[PDB]
């Protein structure tokens, strides 16, 4: 359903913020 | 209603916060 | 109450965040 | 339970929205 | 259940981002 479904987004969401700001501090 | 509608919001926001974070990345790539 | 308002708090703290982080992208840009 | 991962959460983002503050502020 | 493990995976996720900001905070102070 929709808040489920809402959430599942955020997790994925929050995964590709992870592995973006990784990228970010291995250059640095 | 509230709890649908902030949930929904925080989505947004994160997409928003990943999209600028690609972009910092991408300069410094 | 309690739920409703710590969902609140992290969409609040989501839009700072994603504010501070368009400052940052916008002086790399 | 449920009530304690949101607080963890809302905690964490407190976090990481001070830590991005002091990122901005060297930059600014 | 669903909803519970789909919110610790995302307390999970946030402490990654929190750590990862610090190293980036680090660097830079």
């Known amino acids: 359903g ?3 479904q ?3 987004e955020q997790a994925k ?3 590709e913020i992870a592995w973006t700001l990784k ?5 640095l």
Request: no cysteine.
């Open 2 to 4: 929709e808040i489920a």
């Open 6 to 8: 809402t959430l599942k």
């Open 13 to 15: 969401t929050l995964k």
């Open 23 to 27: 990228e970010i501090a291995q250059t």
